[PDB]
Amino acid sequence: ADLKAFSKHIYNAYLKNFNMTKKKARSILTGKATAPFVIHDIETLWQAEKGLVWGLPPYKEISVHVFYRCQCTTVETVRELTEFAKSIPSFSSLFLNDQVTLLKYGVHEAIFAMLASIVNKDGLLVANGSGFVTREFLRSLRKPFSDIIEPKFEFAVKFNALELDDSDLALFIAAIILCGDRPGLMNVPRVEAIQDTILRALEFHLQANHPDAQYLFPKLLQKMADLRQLVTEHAQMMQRIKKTETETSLHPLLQEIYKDMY
Amino acid sequence: ADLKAFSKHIYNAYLKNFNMTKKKARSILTGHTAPFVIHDIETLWQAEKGLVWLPPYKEISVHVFYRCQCTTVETVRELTEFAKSIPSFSSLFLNDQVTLLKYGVHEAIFAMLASIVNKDGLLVANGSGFVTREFLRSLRKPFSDIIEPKFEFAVKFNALELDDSDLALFIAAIILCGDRPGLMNVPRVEAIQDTILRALEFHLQANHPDAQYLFPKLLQKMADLRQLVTEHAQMMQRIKKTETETSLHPLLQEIYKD
Ligand SMILES: Cc1cc(SCc2[se]c(-c3ccc(C(F)(F)F)cc3)nc2C)ccc1OCC(=O)O
Ligand SMILES: Cc1cc(SCc2[se]c(-c3ccc(C(F)(F)F)cc3)nc2C)ccc1OCC(=O)O
Ligand SMILES: CCCCCCO[C@@H]1O[C@H](CO)[C@@H](O)[C@H](O)[C@H]1O
Ligand SMILES: CCCCCCO[C@@H]1O[C@H](CO)[C@@H](O)[C@H](O)[C@H]1O
Ligand SMILES: [Cl-]
Ligand SMILES: [Cl-]
Ligand SMILES: [K+]
């Protein structure tokens, strides 16, 4: 494969399928020419919900409302990641069951990697950039809901230090989805071969795009391992919430993702 | 009238994605170049040598079994693309798409098989071969027994004289089935199926104005196909149990996983 044309193709599929790019997010977070409405307590969340910014279950309390907002966010991103993946060369050539296995075990890894794009150390963009929810407000939620969000900030701030751009991330995300190690995958050799092409494209891309960045490719391989561990811990927290907070609901798609994880 | 447009869209998906139409098949089966007739070991070998066209060759009945599997896998590819070319199907989450295909493809395969079948045999290799029903009956058990019920279904199904535009809606209705195990968005699939069934109802009145009771007859055929697949799966289970030297294609393993 022509690696340069391959990478540009995945870059364009990324721009076509993800509305909020890191480029757009960073210009908002630094104030380039409407600023985001800051959500930092109940009153501003309520205002944001009325129209300042923005279906869900009936409002019971702040921590559960945020928990449901998190689920709606991730379900939307699963839709975008599905369309993105279908544009990766030879992903659509897999039988549909292997496509589902790759997305099932990969979407959260990709979500938490892309989450870093819309995050700084003080909070995250919500609602296509029109809101900003502060990290301190999220810490103020009652357990178990506060504990599940903070590790993602921790990962994101370290990941953002690598200073990837959208062209890097498009290959990185593709590599996460095209993973031959997923449980129950049918055509492992084919998935392994696609991933190798993506990784060779990524290594080549980084030489060109980050010439002075030392050890960047192996650092990104380690971040992929780090994300797998982040997702394992996240899945375990979600299952504990499902067990102890019997009155809170889990979106059916997320139940299907978390079904056979442990 | 929106149903008419909806039907035309499903018909185009069918014309775009299936390798063989019933119109094409029936013209071949009624006679440039006729299909090569496979009716015994010698003619099957000639067909494999290039006259028409897998795991290492063990014996005739198992060889045919493997060709059945290859044919099925190919049709799963086509049915996947057909369903993806239906917008309301492609809007479901991918897991529901897989559930519908997992539990629907064999029903659809056996319905479409009728298109390439007459009482004497069936077309193979994109119509360039014809394998006789008598030859398939001559294979050893368990391989002869699993094929014959499909001829019996097909001859009765072909007496309804559906054309490709009818079949496109019929197959869409089979795939968009709200009753499949593990389906996530059941009400959405149910809504799509009811739209397909209403479009089919109107299509049959337009296309078969004189055919009395044709729509309920097709609903019954859908029920019959579910039973045919139940019996087929039981026979495949017995082959997995008793023919330990015969392999099963990985995709079919996933379909039959249970
Ligand atoms: C419980 C849970 C936590 C996380 S942590 C990363 C976060 Se925080 C967040 C958010 C926060 C506040 C608001 C609001 F203030 F506006 F309400 C909106 C959005 N979005 C993401 C992606 C990810 C998934 C998840 O559950 C869904 C799943 O497992 O798929
Ligand atoms: C074992 C089995 C039987 C059937 S019966 C309907 C038939 Se017959 C046939 C065929 C016959 C002869 C030849 C050759 F003589 F030319 F070699 C080629 C093709 N194809 C189909 C679809 C369907 C599935 C199945 O197993 C696969 C599964 O269950 O998925
Ligand atoms: C498009 C036709 C695919 C038919 C085989 C589906 O097979 C299914 O794939 C799922 C993974 O997607 C598995 O969870 C499930 O156990 C398996 O039976
Ligand atoms: C595209 C994202 C799909 C994530 C949910 C996958 O969910 C899976 O769907 C399969 C049916 O296809 C089931 O066999 C399996 O049990 C379920 O875990
Ligand atoms: Cl940061
Ligand atoms: Cl089945
Ligand atoms: K017939």
Author numbering:
A (entry chain B): 173 to 205, 208 to 228, 234 to 441
B (entry chain A): 173 to 203, 207 to 228, 235 to 439
From the paper:
Peroxisome proliferator-activated receptors (PPARs) are nuclear transcriptional factors belonging to the ligand-activated nuclear receptor superfamily and consist of three known subtypes: PPARα, γ, and δ 1,2. Upon activation, these receptors heterodimerize with retinoid X receptor and regulate the expression of genes involved in energy utilization, cell differentiation, proliferation, mitochondrial function, glucose homeostasis, and lipid metabolism 3-5. PPARδ, also known as PPARβ, is ubiquitously expressed in murine and human tissues, being more abundant in the brain than other PPAR subtypes 8-10. PPARδ is expressed in most brain cell types, including neurons, astrocytes, and microglia 11-13, where it regulates neurogenesis, oxidative stress, neuroinflammation, as well as lipid metabolism 14-18.
Among them, the PPARδ agonist 5a containing selenazole core showed excellent agonistic effect and selectivity for PPARδ. Our synthesized PPARδ agonist 5a exhibited sub-nanomolar potency (EC50 = 0.7 nM) and excellent selectivity for hPPARδ (>14,000-fold selectivity over hPPARα and hPPARγ), demonstrating similar efficacy and better selectivity compared to GW501516 (EC50 = 1.2 nM and 250-fold selectivity over hPPARα; 1,000-fold selectivity over hPPARγ). To clearly understand the binding mode of 5a in the ligand-binding site, we determined the crystal structure of the ligand-binding domain (LBD) in the complex 5a-hPPARδ (171-441). Compound 5a binds in the ligand-binding pocket in a similar manner to GW501516 39. The acetic acid moiety forms hydrogen bonds with the side chains of H287, H413, and Y437; corresponding bond lengths are 2.8, 2.7, and 2.6 Å, respectively. A pi-sulfur interaction with a bond length of 3.9 Å was observed between the selenazole ring in 5a and the C249 side chain. Hydrophobic interactions with side chains of residues L433, T253, F246, L294, V312, and R248 stabilize the complex receptor-5a. The trifluoromethyl group in 5a establishes a weak hydrogen bond (2.9 Å) with the side chain of W228. This interaction was not observed in the co-crystal structure of the complex GW501516-hPPARδ, which showed a different rotameric conformation of the W228 indole group 39. The increased potency of 5a compared to that of GW501516 for hPPARδ is likely attributable to its additional contacts with the W228 indole ring through a hydrogen bond involving C(sp3)-F-H-C (sp2).
